[PDB]
Every structure is written in structure tokens, then in C-alpha cells.
């Protein structure tokens, strides 16, 4: 076990001790990365990449702490983006200059009978909502919105009934995690998509009916720039044809498939997260993130290719740092009884890029 | 606020009942829970989520909720039980917590 | 093999799902509860890939349901039916 940092390459070596009462599964990141290494990675790099029951995010993977002895379970690519856009899809315009295009400003001259008229106006800094844009946010399949302030939530058992599901040959399957979508609107943290985000359990968590503080709920909020909010409608459509008799009618888009001109970010990867999945299509990138008796010792080595950060940004970045306060025990270390624990789920997106 | 009796009292051993009341949007919806505050210190949690209580708290203390009125019950009153008592609940109208007026317990 | 069954039947996922939202008895007060997704309940496990598009996956059926509105203390969670679904990343 160790790591070597050479230029754009990283060599991660992981050795564990196992016991067999079978297969080996190393597919989770914290197998190959210490927290410090993981930090050393995500802070300085814009992207990285390495050089059938595994892809189901099951247990039995090598323990994060190398001194842990574990049990073998019974058997039965492009650079991942690790950056946050510094611009939002709708704001790509120059704020100082009008577009030469025009939009429809006014359908009436005011209140009265037979006020029909057409007026047009320049799209410019004054009104940025209406400017024509070359690209649009990616697809969405709506998730129900659940609040971590529970009094807010409706008093009814909607856990299975209200959850977006896909049914296949008469069997119903919950949509989890689903298309990669922003977890929540800006400023609304307390909510979280029903099956929208990955949920990791804390060290020493009970198997069933655990409370909220026992689990760690990741959020994809970083991608809210290119991707729709998972709990909101992708937008509105025109549902009819207007006339002197009939008013315009719109409707909400609860689900929207790919269109020409959609750009999006995939779901993030985490220190606890899986690395790869076997492709059974479109955009093969797996939805949970990543890339598409006896005893003994086991080692594993993986070469990682890196994409360095070239930015000209003047002001300092948001960086991933270790908390500094007086505490009972060091995060990412052992307690007095000797139990290793991972207190916070760690993402990959800190450094920034233009859109 | 939550209407709550100013003071209740009893000799040691007698069951004492504190009951606070509120609107349907207030205590009728959601739940109640009880804090006991000894003079000069922070409050302490007796009963929470209407009828349940913490391990530290003694068996005699009891809780209940019926409609828009909830009530705390103390069985076997003791001298150590002389203190201030509040019932607390979320409020959907205000979107926050609401504290009932404090009730004092005096052993006779 | 079927798309949804690609999992190992013997082992739990380390992911969690929202098993129960009303823990109380009688009052049925709103609570958050989570459970390990595992061989006990296979419908809820998080899956890397989803079935391909459908225009009415069995063509005599709906592709699935989605949530229509925001739940609230006042409003129930309401789902609609997906009759047609275009391409989504991860479809096969």
C-alpha cells in the first residue's frame, strides 16, 4: 500500500487481508484512496480516469481502513468531470450588449375591447429571460419532494405510492437514483428528492428503519447550472391553439426526453461511491456515477490519468478542507474502541470552469 | 402561545395534571412535548412526541394528546419535581415552534 | 436476465432508501425512516441502467409514473402516468 504522484499520473496500491468461508469486489473508491489522497486529487485536478454482479453497488468490498480484515462475499473512457461550472446555462450572454434578435413584447395596447396588437422588442440586458440561447438544459424525470422538516411533509404514507417508478413486464421498479438532476433549488436545502440522491449510512448504522441522522444524504447541487432541478417541472408547453374565443393554455412538463441541443452533467462520484459499472443504449455512463476456511493477502494497483487545472481565475477557489475545532476524535480516523469511520460523504466537484 | 395553567400543586404522592391547549393548526396538527426547567439552569426534556419519553426521565412522568389539548401527567409527586414546565409544539400557521406559558409545580 | 434483476440476489446494497414516512401509531405522525435496500426488497434498489424508450418495455402498458406536484402538509403526493418517454441517459 502507498500512492505515487507523478505529473499527470497517480499510482494507487491497496493491500488487504481476507478470509474465505466467492469473488473480490474493489469497485468502490475508498478502497484505492486514502482521504488525504482523495483530497490531494479533487483539489488540484479537473478530471481523472483509470488506466456480472459488480455494478449493483453491493457490499463486501475491501474495507477503507487497510488494517481491517474482512470477509469475502458469496457469489450469486472519458475523464470523469470533477469541477463545478462557474457559469449557468442561461447566463452565458454578454451583459453589456443587446442581441440583434427581437421578441414579442405586447399582445394588447391595454384594457378594452378589441385590443389585439403585436409589438416586438430587442432582447438585451434589461430582460435576459427572453434571449435566444444556443443550448438548453438536459432531460428530467420528476422526483417527489420530501422535506427534512417533517411537519412540512404531508401526513400520509406516500413513501411507495408517490414515488416515481418504471414498470417492466408487470413488475414495478423505483427510479433510483435516476437521471442526474440538481437536488434542490438554490436556497432550499431542507428538501431532498425521494429516490433522487444517493444515501450512505453512517458507521454503525442499523439495518432497518433508521432515523435521518444515521444516514448521509448526498446532493448533486453543484450541477444545478446545467441540469434541471429534480423536484421541479422542466418547463411549460403550449397545450392548445389560441383564438378570439379560446385563451392560451399551458401545461407542466413532468418528464422530458433528450432533445437536440441539450447539455448536462453526469452524477458525481464519491469516496464511498462505486467506480465502474458493466454496460448491459444511450449515454452509457452509469446512473449511480462512475465509468461504464482459508485466508491470505490481496493487493490491487490502478494507474490514474489526471487532467490538470489550467485556470486563469484571479480570486481563490472553493477548496476542500479539513474541519478545525476541538473534538472528541479526529475525522477519518479511529475512535478509542478502534473503529474507523467516514463522517462526511465526499464529492468530487470543487474547482471551477467556465461554461 | 399555548394556553397553559399558571401553577399546579400537590402534596407528595398525588397525581398532578398539567394540560395545555391550542388551535387545530397548532397542537391539533403535529405534536407536543414537555420540558422541565429547574430554576437557574437550562430546560430539560421530560416527554417528547406526545406520549414517549427519554431514558433518563423517570417512569412516573407521563404524556398524552387528545384533539387540540395535550396533558402531562405526574404520578407519585416528589419534592424533586418542583420546577417549571413548558409544553412545546410546531405550528403550521407560523411555520415554527410555539412555547406554552410556563407552569410552576409546588409541593404542599 | 432481465434489466431490473442484474443484482446479486444474496447481498445488500450499501445504499439506503426511504422505507417509512409515518412511524406513529394512530396519530400516524410524519417521520423519516430509512432502510438498507437488499434481497428482501429488490424493487427499490438503485440501478445503473434503465429500460429504453416507450411509446404506447411492454407497449400495451405505461412506462411508469412520475410525481405531479409538491407534497405538503395540505396536499397529497400525486403521481401521473407516463404514456410516452423519449431517450434518457442510461437507457438500453
Amino acid at each position: 500500500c502507498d500512492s505515487q504522484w507523478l505529473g499527470d499520473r497517480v499510482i494507487t496500491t491497496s493491500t488487504r487481508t481476507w478470509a474465505l468461508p466467492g469473488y473480490f469486489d474493489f469497485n468502490r473508491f475508498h478502497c484505492h484512496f486514502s482521504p488525504r489522497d482523495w483530497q490531494r486529487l479533487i483539489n488540484n485536478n479537473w478530471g481523472f480516469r483509470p488506466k456480472y454482479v459488480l455494478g449493483s453497488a453491493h457490499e463486501g468490498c475491501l474495507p477503507p481502513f487497510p488494517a481491517d480484515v474482512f470477509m469475502i462475499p458469496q457469489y450469486g473512457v472519458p475523464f470523469h468531470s470533477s469541477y463545478a461550472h462557474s457559469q449557468s446555462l442561461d447566463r452565458l450572454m454578454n451583459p453589456l450588449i443587446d442581441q440583434y434578435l427581437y421578441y414579442l413584447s405586447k399582445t394588447i395596447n391595454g384594457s378594452g375591447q378589441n385590443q389585439q396588437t403585436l409589438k416586438f422588442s430587442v432582447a438585451g440586458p434589461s430582460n435576459m429571460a427572453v434571449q435566444g440561447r444556443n443550448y438548453i438544459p438536459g432531460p428530467s424525470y420528476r422526483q417527489q419532494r420530501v422535506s427534512t422538516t417533517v411537519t412540512q411533509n404531508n401526513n400520509s404514507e406516500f413513501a411507495w405510492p408517490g414515488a416515481s417508478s418504471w414498470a417492466l413486464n408487470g413488475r414495478n421498479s423505483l427510479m433510483n437514483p435516476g437521471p442526474a438532476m440538481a437536488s434542490h433549488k438554490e436556497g432550499e436545502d431542507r428538501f431532498f428528492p425521494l429516490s433522487g440522491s444517493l444515501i450512505f449510512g453512517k458507521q454503525g448504522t442499523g439495518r432497518d428503519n433508521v432515523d435521518a441522522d444515521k444516514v448521509m444524504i448526498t446532493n448533486e447541487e453543484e450541477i444545478k447550472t446545467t441540469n434541471p432541478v429534480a423536484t421541479e417541472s422542466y418547463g411549460q408547453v403550449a397545450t392548445n391553439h389560441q383564438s378570439a374565443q379560446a385563451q392560451a393554455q399551458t401545461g407542466w412538463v413532468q418528464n422530458q426526453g433528450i432533445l437536440p441541443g441539450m447539455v448536462w452533467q453526469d452524477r458525481d462520484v464519491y469516496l464511498q461511491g462505486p467506480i465502474w459499472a458493466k454496460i448491459p443504449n444511450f449515454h452509457p455512463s452509469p446512473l449511480m456515477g462512475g465509468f461504464g476456511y482459508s485466508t491470505g493477502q490481496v493487493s490491487v494497483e490502478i494507474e490514474w490519468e489526471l487532467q490538470k487545472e489550467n485556470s486563469k481565475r484571479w480570486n481563490p477557489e472553493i477548496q476542500y478542507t479539513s474541519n478545525y475545532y476541538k473534538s472528541n476524535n479526529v475525522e477519518f480516523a479511529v475512535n478509542t474502541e478502534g473503529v474507523y469511520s467516514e463522517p462526511r460523504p465526499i464529492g468530487t466537484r470543487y474547482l471551477t470552469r467556465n461554461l | 402561545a399555548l394556553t397553559q395553567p399558571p401553577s399546579a400543586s400537590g402534596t407528595p404522592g398525588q397525581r398532578v395534571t398539567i394540560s395545555c391547549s391550542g388551535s387545530s393548526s397548532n397542537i391539533g396538527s403535529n405534536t407536543v412535548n414537555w420540558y422541565q426547567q429547574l430554576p437557574g439552569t437550562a430546560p430539560k426534556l421530560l416527554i417528547f412526541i406526545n406520549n414517549q419519553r427519554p431514558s433518563g426521565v423517570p417512569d412516573r412522568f407521563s404524556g398524552s394528546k387528545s384533539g387540540t389539548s395535550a396533558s402531562l401527567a405526574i404520578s407519585g409527586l416528589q419534592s424533586e419535581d418542583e420546577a417549571d414546565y413548558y409544553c412545546t409544539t410546531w405550528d403550521g400557521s407560523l411555520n415554527g415552534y410555539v412555547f406554552g406559558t410556563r407552569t410552576e409545580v409546588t409541593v404542599l | 436476465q432481465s434489466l431490473d434483476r442484474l443484482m446479486n440476489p444474496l447481498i445488500d446494497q450499501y445504499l439506503y432508501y426511504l422505507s417509512k414516512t409515518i412511524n406513529g401509531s394512530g396519530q400516524n405522525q410524519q417521520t423519516l425512516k430509512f432502510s438498507v435496500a437488499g434481497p428482501s426488497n429488490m424493487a427499490v434498489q438503485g440501478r445503473n441502467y434503465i429500460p429504453g424508450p416507450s411509446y404506447r418495455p411492454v407497449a400495451t402498458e405505461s412506462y411508469g409514473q412520475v410525481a405531479t406536484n409538491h407534497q405538503s402538509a395540505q396536499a397529497q403526493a400525486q403521481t401521473g402516468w407516463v404514456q410516452n418517454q423519449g431517450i434518457l441517459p442510461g437507457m438500453v
Epitope: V150, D189, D213, M216, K326 | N33, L45 | L32
Partner: nanobody, 120 residues
Framework: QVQLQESGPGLVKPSETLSLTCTVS????????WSWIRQPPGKGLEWIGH???????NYKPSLKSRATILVDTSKNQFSLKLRSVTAADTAVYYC??????????????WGQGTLVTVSS
């Protein structure tokens, strides 16, 4: 183990901004709401507001626009700031932790509380 301690100037001149910080020690602030509740001397309790470790914020309606709550996860400390203070704001301010990681159901732990007096 979770220990809460409030710190702040014991004395504040009228119409000055009030500032308090609560530094939790021994346990992280992650996955838990945190609230300030106030008590005037010999009077009942008011709930100021609470904040969720990721920064979501809720206030007592009457008390908005004079109050602000911030959270610093790095320092693991948690702040209240209150403006345009008056003698009506002289009270003991408590730092409490919301229960079982979910907002709206009591407070599990309580700070020692600190007295703040508005006088000149």
C-alpha cells in the same frame, strides 16, 4: 458526546447589533438542525429561529428582519446576530440542538445559555 457553549458580549448598547456564537464541541454539526431560543428574566421562552447544517434558515415571523443566523461548518460553530436591540431584548439566549436529525420535534441538547443585557 455533544457540548454546546454560547459566547458573546454580556452588555450591548441600545440600537446596536447583538452578536452571539455557539461553538459545539465533541461532535460535528452535520445532519442536524440548530436553533436559538431566548428567555427573558423570569419569563417564558421564545424560539428565535433555527438553521440547518447546510445553511437552510427559518425564523420566528415577528422576529425576521431584525435577526440573522449563520453556520460555519469548518469551525463547527454557529452564530446568531440580532439588530436594533432594545431593552425588550435583554434575556438569556440558549443554543439548542434539534432532535433526531429532523426539524420540528423538540430539542435534544441545550447549551448553558448566556445572559445579555441591553443598557448604557
Amino acid at each position: 458526546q455533544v457540548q454546546l457553549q454560547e459566547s458573546g458580549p454580556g452588555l450591548v448598547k441600545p440600537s446596536e447589533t447583538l452578536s452571539l456564537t455557539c461553538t459545539v464541541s465533541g461532535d460535528s454539526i452535520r445532519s442536524y438542525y440548530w436553533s436559538w431560543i431566548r428567555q427573558p428574566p423570569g419569563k417564558g421562552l421564545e424560539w428565535i429561529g433555527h438553521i440547518y447544517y447546510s445553511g437552510s434558515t427559518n425564523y420566528k415571523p415577528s422576529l425576521k428582519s431584525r435577526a440573522t443566523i449563520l453556520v460555519d461548518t469548518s469551525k463547527n460553530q454557529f452564530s446568531l446576530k440580532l439588530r436594533s436591540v432594545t431593552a425588550a431584548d435583554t434575556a438569556v439566549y440558549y443554543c439548542a440542538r434539534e432532535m433526531t436529525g429532523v426539524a420540528g420535534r423538540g430539542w435534544d441538547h441545550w447549551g448553558q445559555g448566556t445572559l445579555v443585557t441591553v443598557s448604557s
